[PDB]
Design a protein around this ligand. Structure first.
Ligand SMILES: O=C(c1cc(Cc2n[nH]c(=O)c3ccccc23)ccc1F)N1CCCNCC1
Length: 357
């Protein structure tokens, strides 16, 4: 009646990673960091229904914000309802009334993150196959399997190692230097099929995607997703950066003794015909007709003459390798750094996962 736990098959680096991204503490920290009341709303109580009800509250809230004094219920009152569904903590003071587009998008962001934490929580739920079996896998092995995603750790002697590292350092911040620790090759199986579609679609680049640790698991499972209610300076799509230092701004650092651990994805993106804008536009949901991507061109770009290429699945993929240089053409843009945009999930394939300090 005493089931056996089998020895773990994973190496140390991958154990740490799996530990981190499923860590209850890490999840609770993220929630606290978003002013969520963790005691009034425990990880094991997070439901998709609550999150849905949460979203509805923001929707109604938006109708009031956009609608010129409609005549319905006030922002103050409608906010109270939102907080009633999704408990907040501010040192036991009255939660702040949502009364601005900025704040409306703030709560949507949090709800979207919370959503991927719940996704991770439901992922760990014990099934029946795991109960009828008399020999259970090492907890880390099991969680890793729940991902349904091959993560293969690379080393100093991997073809794409000196490349991903040169990319990292030249584009990163000159001073607050980010430090490479580990690189995992990511074969998210389930993306392979739908990505085949754009095989004729050229112009492929390897771009950065910074993310806080709370959703990393969710992404390793479902891939990058165009979510409802997600907005940005370039509209509703999946955002990428060519400059590392841009994406790392979105990598919330989690403490581990003396160092701050962080994870970043590298993605293969089928950009195709690029549409270059130099001004904000939060209303875009697709490129202009004839275009496959939109690129908010910043004041600088990794020296294009230093570009190199890798071969991923028979395809040449562009990898930036130079320090950012000025682009005189876009010296007056509203973007400091480039923001690459695709508006269909299929144009993106996760290739690499990094740990930095
Ligand atoms: O990439 C985004 C997105 C990102 C951002 C910010 C952001 N996040 N992360 C980045 O690496 C990044 C890079 C360049 C520009 C922005 C970013 C804002 C709104 C978003 F909709 N997605 C939206 C959220 C869900 N998961 C898929 C991706």
């Amino acid at each position: 009646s005493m089931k056996r736990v089998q020895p773990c098959s994973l190496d140390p680096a991958t154990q740490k990673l799996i530990t981190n991204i499923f860590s209850k503490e890490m999840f609770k920290n993220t929630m606290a960091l978003m002013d969520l009341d963790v005691k009034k709303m425990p990880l094991g109580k997070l439901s998709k229904q609550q999150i849905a009800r949460g979203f509805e509250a923001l929707e109604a809230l938006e109708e009031a914000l956009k609608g010129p004094t409609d005549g319905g219920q006030s922002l103050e009152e409608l906010s109270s309802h939102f907080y009633t569904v999704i408990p907040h903590n501010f040192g036991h003071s009255q939660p702040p009334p949502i009364n601005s587009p900025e704040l409306l998008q703030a709560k949507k962001d949090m709800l979207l993150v919370l959503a991927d934490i719940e996704l991770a929580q439901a992922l760990q739920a014990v099934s029946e196959q795991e109960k009828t079996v008399e020999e259970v896998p090492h907890p880390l092995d099991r969680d890793y399997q729940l991902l349904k995603c091959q993560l293969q750790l690379l080393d100093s002697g991997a073809p794409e190692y000196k490349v991903i590292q040169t990319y990292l350092e030249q584009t990163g911040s000159n001073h607050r230097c980010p430090t490479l620790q580990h690189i995992w090759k990511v074969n998210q199986e389930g993306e392979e099929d739908r990505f085949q579609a754009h095989s004729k679609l050229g112009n492929r680049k390897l771009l950065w995607h910074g993310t806080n640790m709370a959703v990393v698991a969710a992404i390793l499972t479902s891939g990058l997703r165009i979510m409802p209610h997600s907005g940005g300076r370039v509209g509703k799509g999946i955002y990428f950066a060519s400059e590392n230092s841009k994406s790392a701004g979105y990598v919330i650092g989690m403490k581990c003794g003396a160092h701050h651990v962080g994870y970043m994805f590298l993605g293969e993106v089928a950009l195709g015909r690029e549409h270059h804008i130099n001004t904000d536009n939060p209303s875009l949901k697709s490129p202009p007709p004839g275009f496959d991507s939109v690129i908010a061109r910043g004041h600088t770009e990794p020296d294009p003459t230093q570009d190199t290429e890798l071969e991923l699945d028979g395809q040449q993929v562009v990898v930036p390798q130079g320090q950012p240089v000025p682009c005189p053409e876009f010296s007056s843009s509203t973007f400091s750094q480039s923001e690459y945009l695709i508006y269909q999930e299929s144009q993106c394939r996760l290739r690499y996962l990094l740990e930095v300090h």
